[PDB]
Design a protein around this ligand. Structure first.
Ligand SMILES: CCCCCCCCO[C@@H]1O[C@H](CO)[C@@H](O)[C@H](O)[C@H]1O
Ligand SMILES: CCCCCCCCO[C@@H]1O[C@H](CO)[C@@H](O)[C@H](O)[C@H]1O
Ligand SMILES: CCCCCCCCO[C@@H]1O[C@H](CO)[C@@H](O)[C@H](O)[C@H]1O
Ligand SMILES: CCCCCCCCO[C@@H]1O[C@H](CO)[C@@H](O)[C@H](O)[C@H]1O
Ligand SMILES: CCCCCCCCO[C@@H]1O[C@H](CO)[C@@H](O)[C@H](O)[C@H]1O
Ligand SMILES: CC(C)C[C@H](N)C(=O)O
Ligand SMILES: [Cl-]
Ligand code: NA
Ligand code: NA
Length: 509
């Protein structure tokens, strides 16, 4: 089995798995929509009670499976719980990353497309004070790129450039993945992470120089880091905080598990896992939190900045920030740097969510890496046409797989590993080979707190939120639901074929 060549490579690859669009695009919007500082308390608590414990559990499960030649959940869940139902639940460890990859790679392609256009100066020319006269050109720019509907039909009409850039983006992802773990993902992470860090720091510095009649970047930081204990009783903020923690740490996506399956059986995962998690958090709250929000607040003030964040998931990062940058000397190049940063952040994460399907095809169906990577790319490329042409399909996939799915899967992996497999066996497995040991208190957090926490969260979700999503949405959501349910059935069929191949292989041995 392939293995990470170096310790630093492993850490940076895992850090790249985590540090992505979630840190720079998702976090700012989530924090802004939820009262900034009022979001941070639940966020920090979720990191301590859910993020950290699940990260260790996923690293442990992956390393455990890898030692037996398995890097994906259909097989790993079965190793932990010898029940056919384990294999089926395990399918989510292939389905979630595949579905998320389908829309995540497309959004990643937008950052490459924007980076290219901003680099070459093919950007809107706002009329040099009306806030709408400046923002409108950038909104039109994004809308023409992805092809937002101008009428009643829920159809998107992406520009030819956007389509070609998606092709290029898939090719770049393939070029890295086809080289494998050590020579592909690891080697790239050693280049991309330092680059991402430098670009992010530079952008934070430039943003911190922003001062307008409406405010300064400092006003943005105060908004984000000022506690608001009167929201701690709001379920919505907690659901948002936990959701962000899962997304940003790549938890419940089967991605951490697969990457960990390449860690040598004897190698530490306690310190390594904690480090990857900490690096992500610093990149999220310190870097991601200090770019978009402070810039928006400095130029528009808090009230307007919050309204912008609530506008959409892409308004702040693809419209507002470049519009703000356009009002400064060298602003177009600053926009280029921002989108280049987003592209590298996305790329290091997209290769991580495609690797689970690749590992499954290699490990269970015995395909060569070349064939596994190409077929995985083919499925993602084909499937992405749904997200590129059907309005709000992206939103539907992000909901079932990237929001509900990951929390459900996180709870599932915890129950299977810490309850069914055995709390003490699990604890032993996590700490084996550790450079440091997991604090004793976390044994109780993992066994009792985390699952209870997630269970309650899921119940409240299915009661006070999803019913509106099942009855208050446009009929076209069923097109996406139908397709992704089909993807689940397809993956289940592949797991079925994998078990049949194993049976025939065992009979011949
Ligand atoms: C393998 C799956 C193929 C699905 C058919 C995809 C057809 C895409 O069609 C292409 O879309 C681009 C972006 O809108 C346009 O710019 C091109 O002119 C158009 O030919
Ligand atoms: C990285 C290289 C990407 C090449 C993509 C080229 C897509 C060509 O696309 C065409 O470009 C013309 C000029 O901008 C426009 O006037 C056309 O409407 C557009 O369809
Ligand atoms: C569910 C996903 C279905 C994807 C099918 C896409 C078929 C593309 O359809 C094509 O798109 C082009 C650009 O938008 C148009 O210029 C062509 O006239 C149209 O036929
Ligand atoms: C599920 C989402 C699909 C989005 C792609 C919509 C393409 C709609 O485009 C339409 O397709 C018709 C059928 O070929 C053509 O007859 C029309 O001329 C064309 O405009
Ligand atoms: C609810 C999650 C809290 C996480 C914070 C853990 C802080 C670690 O706490 C430390 O753990 C060590 C090992 O068990 C003990 O020996 C120390 O006395 C204790 O202070
Ligand atoms: C799906 C995950 C790979 C996403 C990544 N953790 C991010 O923050 O963008
Ligand atoms: Cl375009
Ligand atoms: Na992240
Ligand atoms: Na990344």
């Amino acid at each position: 089995r392939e293995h990470w060549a170096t310790r630093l490579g492993l850490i940076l690859a895992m850090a790249g798995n985590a540090v992505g669009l979630g840190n720079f695009l998702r976090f700012p919007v989530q924090a802004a929509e939820n009262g900034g500082g009022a979001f941070m308390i639940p966020y920090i608590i979720a990191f301590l009670l859910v993020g950290i414990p699940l990260m260790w559990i996923e690293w442990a499960m992956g390393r455990y499976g890898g030692a037996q030649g398995h890097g994906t959940t259909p097989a790993i869940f079965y190793l932990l719980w010898r029940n056919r139902f384990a294999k089926i639940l395990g399918v989510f460890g292939l389905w979630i990353p595949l579905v998320v990859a389908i829309y995540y790679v497309y959004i990643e392609s937008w950052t490459l497309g924007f980076a290219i256009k901003f680099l070459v100066g093919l950007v809107p020319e706002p009329p040099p004070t009306d806030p709408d006269s400046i923002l409108r050109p950038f909104k039109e720019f994004l809308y023409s790129y992805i092809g937002v509907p101008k009428g009643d039909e829920p159809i998107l009409k992406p520009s030819l450039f956007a389509y070609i850039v998606f092709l290029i983006t898939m090719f770049i992802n393939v070029s890295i993945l086809i080289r494998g773990i050590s020579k592909g993902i690891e080697r790239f992470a050693k280049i991309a992470m330092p680059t991402l860090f430098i670009l992010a720091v530079f952008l934070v510095i430039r943003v911190f120089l922003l001062e307008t009649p409406n405010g300064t970047a400092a006003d943005g930081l105060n908004f984000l880091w000022t506690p608001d204990f009167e929201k701690l009783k709001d379920p919505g903020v907690w659901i948002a905080a936990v959701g962000q923690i899962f997304f940003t740490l790549s938890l419940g996506f089967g991605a951490i598990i697969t990457y960990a399956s390449y860690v040598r059986k004897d190698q530490d995962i306690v310190l390594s896992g904690l480090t990857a998690a900490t690096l992500n958090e610093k990149a999220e709250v310190i870097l991601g939190g200090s770019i978009s929000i402070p810039a928006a607040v400095a130029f528009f003030g808090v009230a307007n900045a919050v309204a912008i964040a609530k506008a959409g998931a892409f308004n702040l990062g693809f419209i507002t920030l470049p519009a703000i940058f356009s009002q400064t000397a060298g602003g177009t190049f600053l926009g280029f740097l921002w989108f280049f940063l987003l592209f590298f952040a996305g790329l290091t994460s997209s290769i991580a969510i495609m690797q689970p399907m690749i590992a499954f095809l290699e490990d269970e169906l015995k395909l060569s890496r070349k064939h596994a990577v190409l077929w995985t790319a083919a499925i993602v490329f084909f499937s992405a046409h749904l997200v590129m042409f059907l309005n709000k399909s992206l939103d539907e996939m992000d909901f079932w797989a990237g929001t509900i799915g990951v929390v459900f899967f996180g709870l599932t992996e915890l129950i299977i590993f810490f309850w069914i497999f055995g709390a003490d066996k699990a604890w032993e497995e996590i700490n084996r080979g550790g450079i440091i040991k997991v604090p004793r208190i976390y044994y109780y957090v993992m066994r009792y707190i985390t699952p209870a926490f997630l269970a309650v969260l899921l119940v409240v979700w299915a009661r006070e939120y999803i019913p509106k999503i099942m009855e208050e949405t446009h009929w076209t959501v069923w097109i996406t639901r139908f397709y992704i349910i089909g993807l689940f059935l397809f993956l289940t069929f592949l797991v079925f074929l994998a078990e049949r191949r194993r049976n025939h292989e065992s009979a011949g041995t």
